[PDB]
Design a protein around this nucleic acid. Structure first.
Ligand SMILES: CC(C)Oc1c(NC(=O)c2ccc(NC(=O)[C@H](Cc3c[nH]nn3)NC(=O)c3ccc(NC(=O)c4ccc(C#N)cc4)cn3)cn2)ccc(C(=O)Nc2ccc(C(=O)O)cc2)c1O
Ligand SMILES: [Mg+2]
Ligand SMILES: [Mg+2]
Lengths: 402, 517, 517, 402
DNA sequence: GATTTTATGCCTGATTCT
DNA sequence: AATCACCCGCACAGATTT
DNA sequence: AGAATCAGGCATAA
DNA sequence: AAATCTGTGCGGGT
């Protein structure tokens, strides 16, 4: 019942798969090496043995079918890991949050009921793809979002793109690639500090010259600096917000802060660029990038895409134009789940021995793992809530940003 | 075959699942009291133009559109969510007007998607008011192809009015309904005075108001729940004992039942209890509820007493239930336990922000329209030279350049501009080079393009006067919009007027009666 | 209650059912070779704008639209019909481009509606060409609310190339596939001479051509089928015997199997036959087909000859099959048995009708456009009186009446207005009162309204000359359309050019091989 | 077995229903009178006992359940019609072709296996409605299309409709109604013969006078009639048609060979008219109707419609306007099947003992019925094909012309 | 057009231990 | 998420009776 | 006699 | 040992 057995009888070359969803299991049954591979679809979420009792565990059908399929016993004085069929086991769940939840449930079951199986290293986790990209001739699969970003960046700078400053220089690859990588890293760093300061404040600081706090002292040049910053911010404002500046001489080094009134109708008291901000390394790297990102572009300039040309006046405009031009004849497909894939794709992505990729589960420490399982999967609400709160956004505020 | 520790995998997977369920599935938002699925369903229905005064549409169409475009989940959950909103005995104020078979209080179940039909309700359009005037922020969908609102610009206090119920990982939320008029009066009282205590607010809001119109017993639980955020209350059914003399035998008549109670299960439980001799003095049980109303009849034995047998039913049967009030909601993307004053303050701040953004958008649009109207009026003032110059134009670009590089006489229209002076109607982005400088208008590129797109039909007198009328009214509109932003009291006056209008439009009477022990 | 004889009721009911099934479900139409379900599905997909170079759509959307709007039957039949058209091993030229798990040659399965996607194919747009130019007849749907085409204006000979198969009450039909290039060559040969014999036609069309590329063993049944409409042919698989020397081993390799045969069932049948000792000399059986080709390997014993076992396999198992050609189709709403010449003649007549109707529609549109352009050109030559009249008038209605009241002198544009062929560029519905009279022009109401909608941008030289160029082009277009409608030889040239273009675009090579016994 | 038995045990006042489908079965169970009515849904088409062997009949689940529900035996030496249950049986199938097919299968089963049940008159056929009409207050159900047409015609002339021809005549009811009914009958007569001639020719011949065969001659008399008809046809076209004509003589009568062409380079080459056509009664009744239908409308004419006056000619447009006026406040619904009807409608339309309508099945002759059953439901294809072809549209082409 | 049983938290009533 | 158990005509093995 | 344990209901997701 | 009888599957419908 709901188990496609294999032909191999020796329990050292067989495999077993625990597929999520009936359609995915049906598709996988077609596209598999029928000699030494088996399938066992799971209709949905399964029993949690950590909270449930032994009698209810035996009463259920999914766990009972799994126990029958594995071939080993259950409980003390009957369990015997030597009588094991399907020496290799693969999970292969979906790539969404419910897939991770089902994976955690299966790991809890295997660890609590059959510790020796996990210890000996007979449990594997599969890594199905997420994106598929075709460009007429080339076709490939891409996992998660990071690899998609890397592929997009590489395709953007794939040939041509000889940037012209004044008449006809040529950065020609590596310099432009380094500049793009640095710009993306700085933007990623900026994106993770939106709560503390406005985006526009960080964006404008890169183009303006360095503050040079070493030679600032009390020359009163900070007043002109903040005035120019406020005027530049207000020049291209398109949201109705207004900006003002305030300065004082509480110490030897004069201090200043902006005041912003925004669409919310409430005014923030200050966003001070205090001693920590100027001494912080984030502003130092921002100024480092800005030093190379000054007004390098001359009166006449353009980007030399392959058999194409377009005048430009800003680096972001050139990047956007290159990205848009690189996405002309590119086709992309996104898989919502395992049920969207035909048997050939599943075979060549997850079930082919010569091109599949998997992870082996191993145990580092016993007491720590037992404590973690008891804390997370137990029937005690308060410890679980405290653990979730500890690793909440309060602990996500990493100040390294690197 | 890379290795991986079991502890790290378990930790990462469970934390990701818990965070996603907490911030994406179960708890509602304090500002509008809608879970993401409700917001996505309402937005999808709004985009299709399924208004409240048009033909119905099949449920399967809306469900499929919601699944395909915005919500990447199954069909059963979405259809059940849509069905629960259309039941008169589930929500205090229905948000979906349905036609078909959406179940019944007895315990039946609704039909499939293929047979039912739905459309938006009249009140629902108030939740999505001024949605197109840049009032709320938009965020990308799962595949980065669509835009969904981050929060609706609600005009109804939806959270208190409709309540909520949800189960998350490590926490849960449960809030009962309320009455609209009482909540609006409380909001106005808070607007008048911002230091009002809980006792002052409870003058206007005595307590909950369920759809089924049962009785609430006790008063300490409500006050404790409002003061702290956790409490317990007792809901008791409405029943009576009636006797017609003659034989001298009385009967118990039940008209109403508590909130979230099934009639069939209650009747079968009563039958089972009286079967096993666990309740004395009950002879016959019958249900005559049909169309006209709800009536459950219990005929007692000859030697029994109505009060004694009646009091045992509350102790044993499910005619009296306990409701546990527990208020939890998302404030700024994190869970928190709220009370009445915090909810009212959040609603008021939301309204202030929405009104400010709407005013800014309207001001920008009015100024942009007035800018083009000025150029059209100036061009019509000097039509003969304009056409004479255009006739000798080799191409439209040369005509546009000739029009731009030449001053023009204001003419008899300059007097109107004397009322439009003081730089009140000029766009912010416009430079001081253009516009009237020394009694000679200077045209821009877009103004010249608009002039070139002029039809002969507008050369008549009536069309000429309509532009002047439009300009004159736009000046007053711009003045009013400026005055609204020039002070803080006018904003509160506008908010009060809107709340009073909503109360007048959607007011109703109270159902549930509160009594002490 | 009223009595009724059983005989009359049985007769009427069964005759009604039989007549509904014969012309409602099973047999195809000769002109385009599509059953009603195929036509309804294709039209529904076309209306939604699901073209061949756009994003895919879920199968549930199309199925629901077809069920609700056009086809009042169950969903399983519609979905199976949609799935069958997307399989490369069922149709010679697929009509639907699918994505998902649509099954394989083993006859395994197909995923449900919520796990697949579909769109139109490139060739499928050739069937529905010139649908909007009033080339076919429309009929009401089952409730008198929609309109559906009576027949598609097909441009591909769909019936011969794709074949058909159907069962009815009292009759059936079964027609195999053919090759497109051969059929187009046959049609071109027929157009040059209508008295062509069957032997002449068979020079361009040797025989059927299945998708699977089997081998046809015989040549006598094809002639009988094409000469009388009924015949029988034999389809044989492709296999060979290869010897690697060493120990004198023999192995049988099977590449290509007949049409409509499942590989898994064939393998299981061979295994059952060798198991039960009914076929001697076979040792082992294996399958090794993976992504590159089909290969079935059979090993034979060292004390047997490969040829005998191969012939026994041909005679016993399903490696050799018989196919009975039986051509039946609807001619004018009645079944009829046909041969090749009748089908070709019907297709040619359909093309002639479609081309004639399209030409008439295009001529009407061109005449209307030229009629409007004449009025605009005449108005552009009297600018000063027109603007004076418009300015003096207070209302657009008064200006329109004043324009219509007086005639307008032609001016310098009289050279081209009189250069037309008298009444060639004049609408048929226009009265003789209006139009170019003796030395003056008379305007209608719609011409005056069009004049009032003119922009000032048209006063430039380039815009003025573009209208004259367009009018001159339209004169030549009208002349060409009239010449096409005039003689009966230009129509054949147009048909030949269209057929040649189709052959160049969608031609391909032959697959099946034909040999004598 | 999906059988909801009734409470009454006396087998002389019970009833049984064999509903088609599952939704209809559920609705019938909801809306039935539980005292003395039972339901038995059928999932789909049932076994054809005429072709099936005796052994396979008992194996099928549907017929086995039906036999068990009826209570009588099956086969010789066990069939016992005296010990019968459910003395009244109602079929109540859907109102489409599939319903008729299922009805024929059930009738075949009952006649072949239980002849005495059919002979004694224990089999009834229900007749649910098809159309529903609403007019605010007056709403009702209509069965079959002919009743719908009659209802529409009656509502079109329900009061008013005083045709003012020249100064002040008044048909006043019966005359107009009889004229309209006769015109509709003639239109139906034209429609049934629409295949053999164009619509325009038949529609125009009614306006023309009689052929006048008395003064017919080879020259100066034969040509005038055909030329007048062709001229009257040519000046009323919208599809680019063309009508031409020729005549000939064969020493007996002067025959016409009119020809027409439209949207085709081909030509039919003949639409002959001779003594046979004029001798036919169809032309006689056409002339009889056309004698009244002439150009009676003067320069001033109108119809005294309620709060409406539409002075126009071409009385067909007047009829269309009257139909539009009738449909102004009319709503029509067409049920797709028994599933659409709610339980109350099913209760009050066919299951109510005092408002339902049914048909009783009786046998006139035995040998004729047996031969018909063998011819139709037998496993011989040639007699069935011959019977279907004989009663095709050729038999429907009745030349009675009355 | 109809077809299973789980996770997640808080409250009740009913049954089982000492 | 694909499967239930029949009607319609045609051709062809493997299995019973003459 | 009174703590301790075991079921069932509620609303969005496999 | 020749002649009947008995099943299976193809594609649109309850
Ligand atoms: C849901 C889907 C199916 O369809 C829709 C619908 N649906 C309808 O509009 C519909 C469909 C059918 C009916 N039918 C009837 O009302 C009648 C009533 C009746 C009663 N008696 N006779 N007839 N029933 C039938 O005709 C019928 C036909 C066959 C039947 N049985 C069998 O065949 C059968 C019987 C026995 C056996 C056995 N052994 C086997 C079979 C029974 N009944 C009404 N409405 C609507 C919208 C959609 C839609 O747009 N979805 C969508 C959009 C976008 C997206 C996206 O974003 O990707 C996703 C999704 C849709 O997919
Ligand atoms: Mg999923
Ligand atoms: Mg039907």
């Amino acid at each position: 019942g709901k188990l496609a057995d294999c032909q191999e009888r020796d329990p050292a070359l067989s495999e077993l798969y625990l597929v999520e969803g009936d359609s995915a299991g049906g598709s996988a049954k077609q596209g598999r090496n029928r000699k030494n591979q088996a399938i066992l679809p799971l209709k949905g979420k399964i029993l949690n043995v950590e909270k449930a009792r032994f009698d209810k565990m035996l009463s259920s059908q999914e766990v009972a079918t799994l126990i029958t399929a594995l071939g080993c016993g259950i409980g003390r004085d009957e369990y015997n890991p030597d009588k094991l069929r399907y020496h290799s086991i693969i999970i292969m769940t979906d790539a969404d949050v419910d897939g991770s939840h089902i994976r955690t449930l299966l790991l809890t079951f295997f660890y609590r009921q059959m510790p020796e199986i996990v210890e000996r290293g007979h449990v594997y986790i599969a890594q199905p793809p997420l994106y598929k990209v075709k460009k007429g001739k080339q076709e490939q699969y891409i996992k998660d979002d990071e690899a998609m970003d890397q592929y997009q960046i590489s395709i953007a700078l794939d040939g041509a793109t000889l940037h012209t400053n004044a008449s006809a220089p040529a950065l020609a690859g590596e310099a432009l690639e380094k500049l793009v990588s640095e710009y993306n890293a700085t933007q990623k760093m900026i994106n993770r500090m939106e709560r503390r300061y406005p985006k526009a404040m960080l964006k404008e600081l890169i183009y303006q010259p360095t503050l040079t706090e070493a030679d600032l002292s009390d020359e009163q040049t900070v007043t002109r600096w903040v005035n120019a910053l406020v005027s530049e911010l207000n020049d291209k404002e398109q949201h109705g917000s207004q900006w003002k500046f305030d300065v004082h001489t509480n110490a030897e080094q004069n201090l200043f802060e902006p005041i912003v009134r925004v669409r919310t109708h409430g005014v923030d008291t200050d966003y001070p660029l205090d001693h920590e901000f100027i001494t912080g390394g984030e502003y130092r790297r921002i100024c480092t990038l800005g030093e190379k990102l000054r007004g390098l572009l001359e009166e006449d300039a353009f980007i030399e895409r392959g058999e194409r040309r377009q005048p430009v006046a800003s680096f972001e405009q050139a990047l956007d134009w290159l990205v848009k031009e690189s996405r002309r004849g590119l086709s992309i497909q996104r898989y919502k789940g395992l049920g969207e894939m035909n048997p050939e794709q599943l075979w060549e992505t997850t079930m082919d021995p010569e091109s599949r990729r998997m992870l082996r589960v191993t145990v580092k420490d016993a007491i720590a793992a037992d404590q973690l399982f008891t804390t997370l999967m137990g029937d005690a609400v308060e410890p679980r809530r405290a653990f979730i709160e500890e690793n909440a956004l309060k602990a996500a505020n990493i100040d390294i940003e690197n | 075959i890379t290795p991986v520790n079991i502890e790290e995998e378990l930790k990462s997977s469970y934390l990701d699942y818990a965070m996603s369920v907490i911030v994406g599935r179960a708890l509602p938002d304090v500002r509008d009291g809608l879970k993401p699925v409700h917001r996505r369903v309402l937005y999808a229905m709004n985009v299709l133009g399924n208004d409240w005064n048009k033909a119905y549409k099949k449920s399967a169409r809306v469900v499929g559109d919601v699944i395909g475009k915005y919500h990447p989940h199954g069909d059963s959950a979405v259809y059940d969510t849509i069905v629960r909103m259309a039941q008169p005995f589930s929500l205090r104020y229905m948000l979906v007007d349905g036609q078909g078979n959406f179940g019944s209080i007895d315990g039946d179940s609704a039909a499939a998607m293929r047979y039912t039909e739905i459309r938006l309700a009249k009140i629902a359009h108030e939740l999505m008011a001024d949605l197109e005037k840049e009032t709320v922020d938009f965020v990308d969908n799962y595949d980065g192809t669509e835009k969904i609102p981050d929060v609706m610009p609600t005009k109804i206090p939806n959270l208190l009015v409709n309540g909520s119920s949800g189960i998350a990982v490590g926490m849960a939320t449960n809030i009962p309904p309320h009455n609209l008029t009482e909540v609006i009066n409380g909001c106005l009282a808070y607007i008048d005075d911002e230091d009002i205590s809980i006792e002052g607010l409870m003058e206007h809001i005595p307590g909950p108001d369920f759809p089924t119109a049962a009785i609430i017993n006790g008063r300490r639980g409500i006050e404790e729940a409002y003061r702290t955020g956790r409490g317990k209350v007792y809901i008791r059914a409405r029943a009576e004992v009636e006797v017609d003399a003659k034989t001298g035998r009385e009967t118990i008549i039940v008209h109403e039942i508590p909130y979230q109670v099934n009639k069939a299960r209650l009747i079968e439980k009563i039958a089972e209890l009286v079967k096993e001799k666990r309740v004395e003095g009950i002879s016959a049980l019958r249900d005559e509820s049909d169309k006209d109303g709800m009536r459950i009849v219990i005929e007692v034995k000859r030697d029994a007493v109505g009060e004694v047998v009646l009091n045992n039913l509350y102790s044993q049967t499910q005619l009296q239930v306990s409701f546990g009030i527990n208020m939890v909601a998302l404030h700024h993307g994190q869970p928190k336990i709220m009370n009445l004053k915090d909810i009212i303050a959040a609603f008021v701040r939301h309204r202030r922000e929405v009104v400010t953004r709407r005013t800014i958008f309207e001001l920008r649009k009015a100024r942009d329209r007035a800018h083009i109207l000025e150029a059209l009026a100036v061009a019509l003032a000097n039509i003969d030279p304009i056409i004479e110059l255009i006739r000798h134009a080799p191409t439209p670009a040369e005509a546009k350049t000739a029009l731009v590089a030449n001053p023009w006489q204001l003419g008899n229209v300059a007097a109107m501009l004397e009322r439009a002076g003081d730089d009140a109607a000029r766009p912010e982005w416009l430079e001081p080079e253009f516009g009237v400088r020394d009694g000679l208008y200077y045209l821009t590129e877009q103004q010249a393009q608009a002039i070139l797109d002029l039809r002969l039909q507008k050369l008549t007198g009536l069309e000429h006067e309509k532009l002047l009328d439009e300009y004159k009214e736009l000046l007053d509109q711009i003045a009013e919009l400026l005055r609204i932003l020039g002070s803080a009291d006018r904003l509160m006056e506008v908010i009060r007027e809107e709340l009073e209008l909503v109360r007048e439009q959607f007011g109703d009477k109270r159902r549930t009666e509160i009594t002490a022990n």
